[PDB]
């Protein structure tokens, strides 16, 4: 229903649709963890060795053998169970404990439940309508002509990532740079590509899922006995595409910051892995990748990755999720469709983000919610 003379005002930085999506995702996520196994019994002393019988050297410090005592009956009859763990999940007290047993409850993700993103459309309730801009080269803010109506938004996949924006959608013609306060270095800059950069990621290790009885109808999923060579997880990123993509970004940054200056890209900054590395979970396992190999320039690329099983979902503390191991190997392909950047004459840009909402805000910059109020008056010729 194109609205021929409508020039409506938008502000993506105040879009409550983003806030709703954030809240809804968290709620769905949390309710999916009510059933299935709680892992309190794993908060025991572990006895760990370094797992070195079939490794490449770059993986030498990554796995722990960790033997421990756990039971199946309230019989005071514990059994030895061992599981390999990634180093990032285990902290030294030879004796070790799981990293989160000091601060939070650990819940096993239920292995039969998938979180694979499916595009979701948001639809207006009766009495409401969604308006959108069709303009190209739109700021995401301010007025726009060529406003049309929406019953349901286009579908958006609820992909959660850090630093790089994956999948979602592409800009209509040229990479777009959008920000709330462009001259304010305290804000994130959302950059939307007009063409994807293809990224191939993998966990090239043929693993085994080990089912451990933990209680009366309860199972714990252990991992171990990896078949074949143990190798480091990684992403390949096509190199030429990445370089061309930055050239486009640089040109647009210059339009905003001056076409007579020089900018560079730095390897982000310090902080926790949830902040400093690229994060995604394809295949069901959580990957943390080093983007220092991408953001290194002044105006294939293999990115090493680490894997964690105990995840503190960004949205809160006091709880942790345990991701069961995935049987076999993981391979996935995705589209980098944008960046979350911050800025520190010349200027320097760094990968940032980490706030889950930026991954939806970057899609919901075209839609606005309004209430219909179909009653009014006017002077005219109309006498009882």
């Amino acid at each position, epitope marked *: 229903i194109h609205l021929e003379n409508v020039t409506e005002e938008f502000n993506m930085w105040k879009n409550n649709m983003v806030e709703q999506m954030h809240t809804d995702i968290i709620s769905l996520w949390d309710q999916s963890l009510k059933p299935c196994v709680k892992l309190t019994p794993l908060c025991v002393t572990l006895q760990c060795t370094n797992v070195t019988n079939n490794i490449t*050297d770059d993986m030498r410090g990554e796995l722990k053998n960790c033997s421990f005592n756990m039971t199946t009956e309230l019989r005071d009859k514990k059994q030895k169970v061992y599981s390999l763990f990634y180093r990032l999940d285990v902290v030294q007290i030879k004796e070790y404990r799981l990293i989160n047993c000091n601060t939070s409850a650990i819940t096993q993700a239920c292995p039969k439940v998938s979180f694979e993103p499916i595009p979701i459309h948001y639809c207006a309730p009766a009495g409401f309508a969604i308006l959108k801009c069709k303009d190209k080269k739109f700021n995401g803010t301010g007025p726009c002509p060529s406003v049309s109506t929406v019953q349901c938004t286009h579908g958006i996949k609820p992909v959660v990532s850090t630093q790089l924006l994956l999948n979602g959608s592409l800009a209509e013609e040229e990479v777009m740079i959008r920000s709330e306060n462009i001259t304010n270095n305290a804000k994130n800059i959302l950059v939307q590509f007009n063409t994807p950069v293809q990224i191939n990621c993998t966990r090239p290790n043929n693993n085994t899922r080990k089912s451990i009885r933990i209680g009366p109808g309860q199972w714990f999923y252990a991992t171990g006995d990896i078949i074949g*060579d143990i190798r480091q997880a990684h992403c390949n990123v096509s190199k030429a595409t990445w370089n061309e993509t930055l050239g486009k970004v640089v040109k647009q940054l210059r339009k905003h910051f001056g076409n007579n200056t020089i900018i560079r890209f730095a390897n982000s900054s310090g902080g926790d892995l949830e902040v400093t590395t690229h994060s995604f979970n394809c295949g069901g396992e959580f990957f943390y990748c080093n983007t220092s190999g991408l953001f290194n320039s002044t105006w294939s690329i293999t990115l090493p990755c680490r894997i964690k099983q105990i995840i503190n979902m960004w949205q809160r503390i006091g709880q942790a999720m345990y991701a069961p191991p995935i049987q076999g190997v993981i391979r996935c392909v995705s589209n980098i469709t944008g960046l979350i950047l911050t800025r520190d004459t010349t200027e320097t840009f760094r990968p940032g983000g980490g706030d889950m909402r930026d991954n939806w805000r970057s899609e919901l910059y075209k839609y606005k919610v309004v209430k219909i109020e179909p009653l009014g008056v006017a002077p005219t010729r109309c006498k009882r």
Partner: antibody
Framework: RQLVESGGGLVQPEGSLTLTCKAS?????????MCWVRQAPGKGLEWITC???????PYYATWAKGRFTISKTSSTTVTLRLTSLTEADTATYFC??????????????????WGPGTLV | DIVMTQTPASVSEPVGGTVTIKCQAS??????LSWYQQKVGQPPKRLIY???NLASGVPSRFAGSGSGTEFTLTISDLECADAATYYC?????????????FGGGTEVVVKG
């Protein structure tokens, strides 16, 4: 950067000795892998043992497992303890360093540096 | 556990000739084999670090190839200076059994 062996000299049957090798000019690091190889004066070369300096894991040839011990003693030195010596073990012993790939053994390129051999 | 056999144990060829040196492994070693040249009184020099890839400073005359369990050198333009014992080294790795068996070698005599 040169490996230098010491502790040579022949020892009578059923005796023991320990060989010493120093990294003159360098320290051990994760890309380096240290090994010992011996060559009897009338023979080719026989691999004995290796150690990886970041966690000091020893590796041994089956024939050597019950007689030879390899151990790191410093960031620049390693030693090899030899016991139950026989006259058949008379050989020139070499200290050597290998290199390789992070993606597959930092030894998968073989020896880039050899010390002068020392005979016992 | 992986053992390599050399052949011919020894050869003799006039200066300017070419020698083929063969090494046969008991197991597939995924082309990680290295080759060495030993002069009398010296530790062996590395010629090849990875099947066909020559070590720095080594002339192209020492090129070689192979796959699987079968590897060879073809050393061309032999000089009396090139007479040496040549050796085949396994370098398989990964396991905790390792055993980087140094295989046997061959004697190459270059005749003037």
């Amino acid at each position: 950067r040169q490996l230098v062996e010491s502790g040579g000299g022949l020892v009578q049957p059923e005796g023991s000795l320990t060989l010493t090798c120093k990294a003159s000019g360098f320290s051990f690091s994760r890309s380096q892998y240290m090994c010992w190889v011996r060559q009897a004066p009338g023979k080719g070369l026989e691999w004995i043992t290796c150690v990886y300096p970041d966690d000091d894991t020893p590796y041994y040839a089956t024939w050597a497992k019950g007689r030879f011990t390899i151990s790191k003693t410093s960031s620049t030195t390693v030693t090899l303890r030899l016991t139950s010596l026989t006259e058949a073990d008379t050989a020139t012993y070499f200290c050597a360093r290998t290199s390789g790939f992070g993606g597959y053994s930092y030894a998968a390129h073989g020896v880039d540096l050899w010390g002068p051999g020392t005979l016992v | 556990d992986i053992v390599m056999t050399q052949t011919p144990a020894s050869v003799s060829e006039p200066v300017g000739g070419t020698v083929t040196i063969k090494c046969q492994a008991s197991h597939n070693i995924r082309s990680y084999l290295s080759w060495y040249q030993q002069k009398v009184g010296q530790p062996p020099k590395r010629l090849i670090y990875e099947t066909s890839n020559l070590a720095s400073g080594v002339p192209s005359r020492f090129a070689g190839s192979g796959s699987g369990t079968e590897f060879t050198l073809t050393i061309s333009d032999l000089e009396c200076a090139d007479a040496a014992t040549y050796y085949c080294q396994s370098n398989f790795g990964l396991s905790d059994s390792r055993t980087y068996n140094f295989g046997g070698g061959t004697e190459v005599v270059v005749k003037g």
